[PDB]
């Protein structure tokens, strides 16, 4: 009449299985077996499966063979009981009852049953709640559960077929998603951005839920399921009521699961893992409980970063106001929709690695399609000659060889010993010609300058200003896998959508941020005052270098050093519309073509041309000004820049006619006063650590976001976006 287990408050054990002809029911038995505080089975029923001469040995062995060919844990009899015989419990759906009930032995719980259940499926709802239900929410209850719960038919299961279900918190006795959603690592896999381990908790999870470091199974099953639900339907807010029905496990443990799913769900949304992207919501639809709502924030700048954080905080239930200096939202996302049936970005338009990219998520949510680039990119000389495939392969080989040795040279150098990448390449190159008396033609040298300029484009600067040590610092961290895409409708759709329904003040350049008093005083250049409890700055790096905002108290010297160790990198775009697709014969449907430079100084002058209609019907070309060439273009007017582009094209297509363009634009980001750059890079002397230091909040009061604050993913719209999500999460925590 007492439990085997030490310190069980089972003052009256009953047998849940009643499978043996001799069940003790609620009587005396040689030994009561304990599965939980409220769950026990009798020695006779124990024997009914455990011993070979009884009727339940057939069952026990079939299950046991499966649990081994599909599992990694011990197939103990207590495990068979918890997986196969323990009754289910389901909570009444009637708003005013909400009581938990035991279903009878033979009923198999399904989501449909959980969705709709009501007591008695007399006033059935008025019968008292089995007292064992309250018992489940005592901290010690879980400590006295023998085995950890394993979920049945988890939505996560199809995505986890490479793991043992029990290691990911699922039952071994079990068994059309967007190709870019790959939220779980596979076992023995290369690093990729925004992937979680399904079988290990990550640092913020261990921090938030310390109680699961002893045993992470319950958390992992619930976290994995939640993610898989989010990714199966990313167009709706994912809520506890949509989760509960998909939690299928026997016994009172299921009651502990649905109580935890809430806490986990709110953690996941705060951190921006689910219920994010372009999901709009409100008012009585806020994603985080009343508990986070009472607070206010001012966000400065309405580009991807500021809009990300604004969207998140607003969805959370928090009061947000955004102050934008310009007469438009978007920042360095600025789309031209005036070309015939083609959208051309003056700023951002490529998505670099789509797998697990939030931009690919948002394209889902919006039903937008992206054009994946082809690999081909011929290197056309002036005037006409496509570069020999062998010559192209030789110079590519050497160029990357030079990068290898730069990488070998840097391993023992400190910041105080940094040299510019440009210098360290030329040297190694000159050292190499000397060493081995090979001679390159004028052409092979020009092909080298193409690659060199292509690095200049990536960095947004001449190679003589960029750190050899730290130019590719971010590749320390896992990077976005998969396709590079043309975002054909433009990033402006995502922007417009994130901004929809938020409080945005345009033409309100901020000048003063005072964080001395009880709350933050923000003052525009015309003297308009705003105040809030928190402030988030997302202005571009170059504006922080020019000190365009007065900070009171001043930013630390440690911050200024980081701010100044990064470059405000720059590129300019030219776009040209033509009467017809003059390049088709020669280019043959390739997405872009290269322009081999005639000389080192001219290398950043339209190095690559992008065909802007992936449907290959309209005729729009885009090209880029990088490196030295940005300097040489600052005094020239738009028409003069055009002329050089046209002269370049007529050299590239020397043996044919090229039409006159019928419309164009030339970008002047460099002299946009609230922007003054294209993207950040590490100047010589710097470290990637500078991104983290800029990212550090001040006094849990002043926060920073933007591409120049994201160490993992600098430069990009994506990087900017994720920095806004990071800060919204930190702001909501407080």
């Amino acid at each position: 009449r007492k439990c085997e287990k030490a310190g069980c408050t089972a003052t009256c054990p009953v047998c849940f299985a009643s499978a043996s002809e001799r069940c003790a029911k609620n009587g005396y038995t040689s030994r009561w077996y304990h599965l939980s505080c409220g769950e026990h089975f009798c020695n006779e029923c124990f024997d009914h499966y455990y011993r070979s001469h009884k009727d339940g040995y057939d069952k026990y062995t079939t299950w046991k063979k499966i649990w081994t060919s599909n599992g990694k844990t011990e197939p103990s009899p207590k495990a068979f009981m918890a997986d196969q015989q323990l009754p289910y419990w389901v909570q009444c759906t009637k708003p005013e009852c909400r009581k938990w009930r035991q279903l009878t032995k033979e009923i198999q719980l399904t989501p449909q049953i959980a969705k709709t259940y009501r007591c008695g499926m007399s006033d059935h709802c008025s019968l008292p709640e089995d007292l064992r239900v309250l018992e489940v929410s005592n901290h010690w209850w879980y400590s006295m559960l023998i085995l950890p719960p394993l979920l049945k038919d988890s939505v996560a299961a199809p995505l986890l077929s490479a793991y043992y279900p029990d290691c990911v918190g699922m039952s071994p006795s079990c068994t059309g998603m967007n190709r870019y959603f790959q939220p779980f690592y596979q076992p023995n896999e290369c690093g990729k951005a925004l992937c979680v381990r399904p079988d290990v908790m990550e640092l913020d999870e261990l921090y938030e839920f310390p109680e699961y470091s002893r045993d992470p199974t319950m958390y992992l099953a619930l976290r994995n399921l939640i993610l898989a639900l989010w990714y199966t339907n990313c167009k709706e807010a994912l809520t506890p009521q949509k989760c509960i029905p998909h939690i299928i496990v026997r016994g009172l443990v299921r009651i502990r699961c649905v109580q935890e799913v809430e806490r986990i769900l709110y953690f996941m949304t705060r951190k921006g893992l689910i219920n994010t992207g372009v999901l709009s919501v409100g008012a009585d639809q806020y994603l985080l409980p009343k508990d986070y709502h009472n607070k206010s924030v001012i966000i400065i700048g309405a580009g991807p970063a500021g809009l990300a954080a604004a969207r998140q905080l607003h969805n959370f239930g928090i009061k947000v106001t955004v102050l934008e200096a310009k007469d438009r939202i978007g920042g360095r996302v600025w789309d031209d929709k005036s070309f015939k049936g083609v959208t051309v970005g003056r700023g951002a338009q490529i998505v670099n690695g789509c797998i697990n990219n939030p931009v690919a998520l948002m394209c889902e949510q919006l039903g937008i399609s992206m054009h994946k680039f082809g690999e081909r990119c011929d290197l056309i000389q002036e005037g006409g000659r496509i570069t020999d495939p062998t010559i192209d392969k030789r110079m590519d080989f050497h160029f990357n060889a030079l990068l290898d040795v730069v990488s070998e040279w840097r391993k023992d150098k400190t910041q105080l010993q940094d040299v510019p990448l440009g210098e360290k390449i030329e040297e190694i190159y000159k050292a190499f010609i000397k060493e081995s008396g090979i001679q390159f033609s004028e052409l092979e040298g020009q092909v080298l300058q193409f690659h060199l300029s292509n690095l200049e484009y990536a960095c947004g600067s001449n190679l003589h200003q960029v750190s050899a040590r730290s130019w590719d610092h971010n590749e320390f961290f896992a990077q976005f896998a998969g396709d590079h895409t043309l975002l054909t409708p433009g990033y402006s759709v995502i922007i417009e959508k994130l901004a929809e329904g938020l409080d945005i003040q345009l033409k309100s350049p901020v000048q003063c941020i005072d964080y001395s008093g009880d709350e933050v005083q923000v003052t525009t250049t015309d003297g308009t005052g705003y105040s809030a409890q928190k402030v988030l700055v997302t202005v571009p790096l170059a504006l922080l270098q020019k000190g365009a905002i007065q900070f009171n108290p001043p930013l630390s010297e440690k911050k200024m050093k980081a701010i100044n160790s990064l470059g405000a990198g720059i590129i300019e775009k030219i776009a040209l519309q033509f009467p017809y697709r003059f390049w088709d014969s020669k280019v043959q449907g390739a997405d872009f073509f290269g322009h081999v430079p005639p000389s080192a100084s001219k290398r950043g002058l339209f190095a690559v041309f992008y065909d802007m209609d992936p449907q290959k019907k309209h005729s729009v070309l885009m090209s880029v000004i990088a490196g030295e060439a940005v300097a040489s273009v600052r005094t020239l007017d738009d028409k003069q820049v055009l002329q050089q582009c046209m002269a370049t094209l007529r050299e590239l297509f020397k043996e044919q006619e090229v039409p006159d363009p019928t419309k164009y634009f030339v970008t002047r980001w460099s002299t946009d006063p609230w922007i003054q750059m294209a993207y950040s890079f590490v100047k010589t002397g710097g470290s990637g650590e500078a991104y983290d230091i800029i990212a550090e909040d001040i006094q849990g009061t002043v926060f920073f976001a933007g591409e120049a604050t994201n160490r993992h993913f600098p430069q990009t719209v994506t990087g900017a976006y994720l920095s806004g999500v990071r800060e919204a999460s930190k702001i909501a925590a407080f």
Binding site: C377, D404, N454, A458
Partner: peptide, 20 residues
């Protein structure tokens, strides 16, 4: 940063690839 490259990605100078 190298990650900005689409057309004609540079390959050299990477760290030894990492697996779980």
């Amino acid at each position: 940063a190298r990650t900005m490259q689409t057309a004609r990605k540079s390959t050299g100078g990477k760290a030894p690839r990492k697996q779980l």
